[PDB]
Design a protein around this ligand. Structure first.
Ligand SMILES: CC(C)C[C@H](N)P(=O)(O)O
Ligand SMILES: CC(C)C[C@H](N)P(=O)(O)O
Ligand SMILES: CC(C)C[C@H](N)P(=O)(O)O
Ligand SMILES: [Zn+2]
Ligand SMILES: [Zn+2]
Ligand SMILES: [Zn+2]
Ligand SMILES: [Zn+2]
Ligand SMILES: [Zn+2]
Ligand SMILES: [Zn+2]
Ligand SMILES: [Zn+2]
Ligand SMILES: [Zn+2]
Lengths: 484, 161, 484
């Protein structure tokens, strides 16, 4: 059997009744007015994101779910910094597909709702669930475009959504399965599948040692799980020598805190401490699928942070790749330790731009929660490009300060050049960003602290409860526009 | 509007609800409030800058420009429905005085204040992080800082011109 | 708009299709089989507690909600200690009514589902919501029996559920509105509206002093809110001299802990620390409405527990009505202090039984959670009557021990006859019960610790999130059976 999802807008002042989309009106005509008749009989009008199901309207569609789309001409909301119409579509289509799945229907056709890309994003992101390890699972639903006119846009939405879902899968998978080695292998197969214009280097411990990445090595040694430095290349520019854009992601497969051990409550979520690596690697995979005309390099140091007889000890001093010494006052501030080495290495590619992503601080969550990813950057041009891209995707970004005020608090160090924790407890996300900056000399660098957007309860309507994979689509959109 | 007082220590937003309401009676050009509102703001930006939540980009820009001159910096924070949703989700009343989660404490606090404002040019300054000075601002000895008084004066001077 | 809720059972092995209730098949017959046809078209069968909505089947009922009732012959489940058939009905009907309300339909007729009392209970308990203090409220729904054959049973369910809902209202209302005086006045009006064979005395502080209730007074003094001792009489026996059954309830309108102050997190729930008073008083109101042929007395000491310059201080020694001295080591163990005096006063009525209820210990919540009310009793006959009544109502009880082992830990006291907290944290609910026992000489006494069933999230399907009003119905059932 097959289900159908159709949209209807909120009634405008001059209108006599709420208007269906082109597809909704076509279906109504196909069934001689039965859809409009039954909707009228059912009562109150459908508002944005709400749904209602009608059965037996047509032999080929035993279940038809009508979804509220809100105001038809809703565009960019200057107060919310996003295209509202697209967000309305994503939420409504997701709700509609979930209803069809609850009815145990394996196939669903989806109304493009005036924006096939947004519709596809709502369907593909909305239906996603990581259930590989469960015996009892919901019915697998195959979603397809209702009609054929907007197929290119629909396919684009499926692509953007699939990129985010790959990030979600990587983040959600338990750490005993999603090890540094496994992560690298999954990224490898996906990237090669995306394009032949790629190269993958799963660098072992011996290479990490040759590169003198002492900061990264200090974090990894506490665990028995082998660390790896994942390096991927996408050669999309017509000019092979064109300087690449470099992406860096924090890849802590599991963060227990080490000797400065974490509290037990909700520590399970630390399996997603490799979200920075997941989002940048998935964005690169998607950019390759899109065949973007640009050169890109992705860097992801991966390891676990565990307590043992050989783990990092508070007060220990380690030497980063650039020769700068770091006093490890708290072993649980490990993300900045591994990133110091990756950021140094990023400069060897003589990049056009350097962008890193990391589930870096709990302070970022206290600051903005899941409302937006915090962006620290020394380039207002770069900030604006990321901001503009986020308006389109709905996966918002918000700027945070990169001031010397914060640097002063990390370079005040008893034993070394820089301390891995600030002198005071205030502004944790800002002092962490300042630390990273001590390992960057590039004029166009941006640091994304995604700790607050690591998970979703129900804030983003179209994502079920679990790891969010944010802000993957914003990175893909940034890359697309940059290439144009 | 009814308010459910789940935590008696989230008192600043309770007294501000009534003051903001009264502010509308003057048919003002702009409404600007300042408060040592949340510990969350301190965790967010510390003493680096005062957090500003506003529904007017014109107003944000005037405050920002004034801060460049005085050196007593301001930094914009979001006013999104995302945060409002977490304070209007209330068991007994119209609005709850604490959010359903600890995340984004300064933002949910701002969202609470917004439920008592209908004016088109309103700005809320959370100065909790700049309440004191240790050694951050070189020209202020250790103690209460009195920030961002000069930025407000500069804003008024420029506005009057 | 007029809605209809109909039930369908799970299919048995030798049946060709799942069977509707009598009302369901009657409606199906009326519409020439269209209900069965559309249900079949909609897909998978409806399991216990699930619902599906069909529109436009009949002019009088634009919206028909079918609900799954589970196995038709489901009786007493020996493993769960309840009548499963009744629990299935309460859950299914509540679910169906919630859907009708979401559709903003003001009136609904409900299938009796083979047990009109259970159906009415699901509808009335399920629709309840405390929204007096909100500007935005759901549509008020008027639920009534579908048909005219089971009127008495339906109304009995409405009565039992209404008793529980009064308890829920009293518990949910904020403490600044629900003061000792307000609680007493609300109970007074409800009891008088229930029967003219009632007497109510809202005893003032001066009476409490005359009665030498020093333990109760010590708790009350910290607050500015005046305390009262509520005493209610229901004269239902044909014989005026027939000894009464006595109910006692803990009435702390708000518990801050006093000098031994509570932590901030979720302290708002302490507005329900008068739940014991709420449940026992509501049960009596319902017994009066039913005109049960028995004499009943209700007693409820009411006050706030607040910190101030005149509040109870740890180490203080107070004297109970019976002359026993109590060492107040922790001011937050206040429930047992006010109950000591109320239990003493209960003996003056030469009662047949003494039953008290109280949101007494966090330990009880750690012990059984919301699964069942803990019952400590010196009478196996009394335990069995409460147990049997709970099987019928579904609002379960579970026996807890009254052993000297626990008494020993509370009479071991540095300054007085008994200490208000045990010498250890182990068995908190049991030592609390042992403390109460030192103020009871009656042969048929039962103490109900309802702390664990104070609230509902999703455990009891037919109760929305909030204060639960449990186990009001179990007390009413006990009284009904006792009177027969
Ligand atoms: C909550 C989470 C974002 C904490 C980081 N993993 P940290 O322990 O490295 O700061
Ligand atoms: C630290 C300080 C700014 C807290 C506020 N006075 P609150 O207790 O009202 O949040
Ligand atoms: C959680 C709750 C039931 C605790 C009691 N009110 P107590 O503080 O009197 O033990
Ligand atoms: Zn993972
Ligand atoms: Zn850590
Ligand atoms: Zn980490
Ligand atoms: Zn406070
Ligand atoms: Zn304050
Ligand atoms: Zn109450
Ligand atoms: Zn207490
Ligand atoms: Zn108490």
């Amino acid at each position: 059997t097959k289900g159908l999802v159709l949209g209807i807008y909120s009634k405008e002042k001059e209108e006599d009744e709420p208007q269906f989309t082109s597809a909704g009106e076509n279906f109504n005509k196909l069934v001689s007015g039965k859809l409009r008749e039954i909707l009228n009989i059912s009562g109150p009008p459908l508002k944005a994101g709400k749904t209602r199901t009608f059965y037996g309207l047509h032999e080929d569609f035993p279940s038809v779910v009508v979804v509220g789309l809100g105001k038809k001409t809703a565009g960019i909301d200057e107060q919310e910094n996003w295209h509202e119409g697209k967000e309305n579509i994503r939420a409504a289509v997701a709700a509609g597909c979930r209803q069809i799945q609850d009815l145990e229907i394996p196939s669903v056709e989806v109304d493009p709702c005036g924006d096939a890309q947004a519709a596809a994003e709502g369907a593909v992101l909305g239906l996603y669930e990581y259930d590989d390890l469960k015996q009892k699972r919901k019915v697998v639903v195959s979603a397809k475009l209702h009609g054929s006119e907007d197929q290119e846009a629909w396919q684009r939405g499926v692509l953007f959504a699939s990129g985010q879902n790959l990030a979600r899968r990587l983040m959600e998978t338990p750490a005993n399965e999603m090890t540094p080695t496994k992560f690298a292998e999954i990224v490898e197969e996906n990237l090669k599948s995306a394009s032949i214009k790629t190269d993958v280097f799963i660098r072992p411990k011996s290479w990490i040692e040759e590169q003198e990445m002492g900061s990264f090595l200090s974090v990894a040694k506490g665990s028995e799980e082998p660390p790896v430095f994942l390096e991927i290349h996408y050669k999309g520019s017509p000019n092979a020598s064109e300087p690449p854009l470099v992406f860096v992601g924090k890849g802590i497969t599991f963060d227990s805190g080490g000797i400065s051990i974490k509290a037990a409550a909700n520590m399970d979520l630390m399996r997603a401490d490799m979200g920075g690596a997941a989002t940048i690697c998935s964005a690169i995979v998607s950019a390759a699928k899109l065949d973007l005309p640009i050169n890109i390099v992705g860097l992801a140091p991966l390891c676990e942070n565990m307590p043992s007889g050989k783990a990092n000890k508070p007060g220990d001093v380690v030497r980063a790749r650039n020769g700068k010494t770091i006093q490890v006052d708290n072993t649980d501030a490990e993300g900045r330790l591994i990133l110091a080495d990756a950021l140094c290495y990023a400069h060897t590619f003589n990049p056009k731009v350097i962008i890193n992503a990391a589930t870096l601080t709990g302070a970022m969550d206290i600051a903005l929660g899941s409302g937006a990813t915090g962006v620290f950057t020394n380039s207002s041009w770069l900030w604006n490009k990321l901001f503009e891209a986020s308006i389109e995707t709905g996966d918002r970004v918000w700027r945070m300060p990169l001031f010397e005020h914060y640097t002063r608090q990390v370079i005040d160090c008893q034993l070394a050049d820089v301390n891995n924790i600030g002198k005071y407890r205030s502004a944790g996300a800002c002092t962490a960003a300042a630390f990273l900056k001590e390992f960057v000399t590039h004029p166009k660098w941006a640091h994304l602290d995604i700790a607050g957007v690591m998970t979703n309860k129900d804030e983003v309507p179209y994502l079920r409860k679990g790891m969010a994979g944010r802000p993957t689509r914003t990175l893909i959109e940034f890359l697309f526009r940059f290439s144009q």
